[PDB]
């Protein structure tokens, strides 16, 4: 037979991660802009389980290793748009930037129709993070794109200006990314808040526990946003098809607000179990500390689910919890994609229970 | 010659308000849905200066009195669509009641094509106001249209038990619409915040005084949230045309937050004039005390200047600053029309400075 044509190559570099896995699926719709859609998806693990039945390409790449990138990427001649969405898993500005380098020195010389390069970064970019991850101190939120860098360090800083050097001068179109906190499905992130607080409840429901909010006076009753992982992908989509969009710095949010003390609510609803909400006059406790000596909890749980295998520092990031928690004031804008003709959006309580909902189907949480 | 043929006829009830002055403008482009439209205006005083020169039929009427609202109504056989964009001026649930029922009453037996009738009404739905303005106490926001009435006296409850019964026995499609915060032009208002700071900077400015903000420290600091006129008759608009919007209780705000920080900012270079904000410590001052003695100074403003005449207390609200600058957690939510499919938007601190804007293009303000 033939080789099956597509319009659009897509390399998804971190496909197994929060927003990676959800390009997997928007990119293989029908009606995706830019298709029919051709996706590899890169990262570092062998292909798991949960994403071998779909129809992407696995690469399995450490990103970090130039002459293993260059063996494994450089063959790709077809790629048309490569979608960035890794990161290492550390603060280290040069050990991310190795990985983007990598990714950049391996494809552009060798996919002669390459066409834009989507770079995900975030909203971290507009504030900073200090004494252990304890004292989170944005200034002028809602947060837009004209913000100035702040004189810190961040590897986004990084990954942009490799972004920029390398598309101008190969006469690539270019976009950023920032989204809000992502709601997603993927088993396998890094920072996953849907699936930390989903494993936190299922392990409260298997031991006859409330789900007892761990988090400050603050984060329970301020204003704050997210962004559904399948909004960020069609986003990202955009800016990669849409000549309106290219070379462009964008936020990504769900278009709306949210507070914590509703989504708890709605989370102990949906694990059948007792709410404790915020009690008056307590201090924020670490729900990393909480959940320390609980592996072999959540091992048991899987088993006697019959869940995705997962390990519970994969599944969960309790820390990133324990950040969300003493957060406020971190609001983004959405009106730069909007004036652009971007109007996607999500209702977030509808994309808050949509995530439970599929790692409830995927078998990732009981 | 012959008689214009319209596709639709609305009754625009509160003409040289807020949003019935937008109405006014809106209702006449070439593209807006349902157009071309005929509009008849309604108010109690005399057509205006600023509007004998739109392509609006005006009627003078004062709305609460029966026999003269049917003498004036009950002729236009042609009405298709009824928008009620008025309120007597007080909380009085009978006499606002009286208003509108004098219009459903005059119009519904002689216009046998009237189709819909959209009430505004606001998010004052949602919240209650204790203690002579000064305790704004709201529950639950971002406020969402399926929260119950609270168990108060609020106008809005006997409008909307008007407009559902009588839409219901003539079978007419109704909407109730509650917009935000409203930023417009009109000098006729009884609550427009815009027009009302506009005024306070002009007095300063000529004052040789700094713009001081009056507020209290929450509400310079917190997130709030707007609707441009222009918006909210476009939202009217859809809710009148677009069948799958019919029989809809609808917020209305541009889509995004913002902070009076940030407003007061601009405000102040809008007039080129020094700011001075929020001074931690400082208790809230009214404004409505800081300007009593100010009627005069506003007419030698206005002859100095040669603006529109207007008297101070039409046009700016100083106590409805005062109720803005006390209140915090009044956010509402677009998601219900979102989903329904209506996405306009505007971005809050462009629609700001276009009222501004429209308001000098208009010589309303210097
Ligand atoms: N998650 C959120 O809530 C959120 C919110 C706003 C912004 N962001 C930003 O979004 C960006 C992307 O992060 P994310 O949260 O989407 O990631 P994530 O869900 O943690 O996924 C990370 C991905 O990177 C891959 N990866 C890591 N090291 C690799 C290596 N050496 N070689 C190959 N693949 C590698 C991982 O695969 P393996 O596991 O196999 O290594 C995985 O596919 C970051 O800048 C992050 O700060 C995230
Ligand atoms: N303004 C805002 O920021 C805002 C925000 C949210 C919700 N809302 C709500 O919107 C609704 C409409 O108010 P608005 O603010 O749009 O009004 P507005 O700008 O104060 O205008 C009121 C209009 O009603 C007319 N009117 C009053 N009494 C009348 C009478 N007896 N006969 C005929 N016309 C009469 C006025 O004309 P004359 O002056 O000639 O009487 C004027 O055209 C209210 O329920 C209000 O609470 C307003």
């Known amino acids: 037979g033939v080789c099956k044509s597509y319009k659009s190559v897509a390399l998804v570099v971190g496909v197994t991660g929060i927003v990676g896995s959800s390009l997997a699926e928007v ?58 969405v890794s990161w290492i898993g550390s603060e280290d500005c040069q050990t991310n930037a190795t990985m983007f380098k990598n990714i950049l020195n391996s494809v552009i010389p060798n996919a002669s129709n390459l066409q834009h390069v989507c770079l995900q970064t975030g909203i971290k970019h507009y504030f900073a993070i200090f004494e252990e991850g304890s004292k989170v101190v944005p200034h002028d939120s809602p947060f837009t794109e004209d913000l100035p860098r702040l004189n810190v360090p961040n590897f986004y800083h990084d990954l942009e200006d490799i972004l920029y050097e390398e598309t101008g001068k190969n006469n690539l179109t270019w976009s950023v990314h ?50 559904d992982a399948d909004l960020v992908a069609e986003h990202e989509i955009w800016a990669a098809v849409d000549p309106k969009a290219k070379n462009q710095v964008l936020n990504c949010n769900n278009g709306d607000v949210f507070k914590w003390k509703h989504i708890w609510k709605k989370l102990a609803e949906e694990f059948g179990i007792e709410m404790v909400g915020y009690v008056e006059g307590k201090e924020q406790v670490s729900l990393a500390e909480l959940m320390k000596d609980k ?62 909902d599929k790692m409830r189907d995927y078998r990732f949480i009981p």
């Open 27 to 84: 990119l293989k719709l029908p009606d995706t802009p830019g298709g029919p859609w051709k996706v590899y998806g890169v990262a570092r693990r062998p292909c798991p389980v949960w994403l071998a039945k779909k129809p992407v390409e696995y690469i399995q790449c450490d990103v970090s290793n130039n002459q293993e990138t260059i063996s494994k990427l450089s063959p790709l001649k077809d790629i048309t748009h490569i979608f960035y």
């Open 178 to 227: 920032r989204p809000a906190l992502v709601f997603g499905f993927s088993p396998c992130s890094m920072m996953n808040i849907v699936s930390t607080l989903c494993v936190y409840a299922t392990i409260c429901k298997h031991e006859n526990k409330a789900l007892v909010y761990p988090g400050s006076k603050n984060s329970w009753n301020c204003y704050a946003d997210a962004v």
């Open 295 to 356: 592996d072999q909890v959540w091992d048991e749980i899987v088993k006697k689910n019959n869940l995705v295998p997962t390990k519970l520092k994969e599944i969960a990031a309790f820390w990133f919890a324990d950040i969300a928690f003493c957060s406020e004031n971190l609001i983004s804008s959405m009106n730069k994609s909007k004036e652009l003709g971007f109007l996607g959006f999500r209702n977030s309580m509808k994309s808050f229970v949509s995530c439970i």
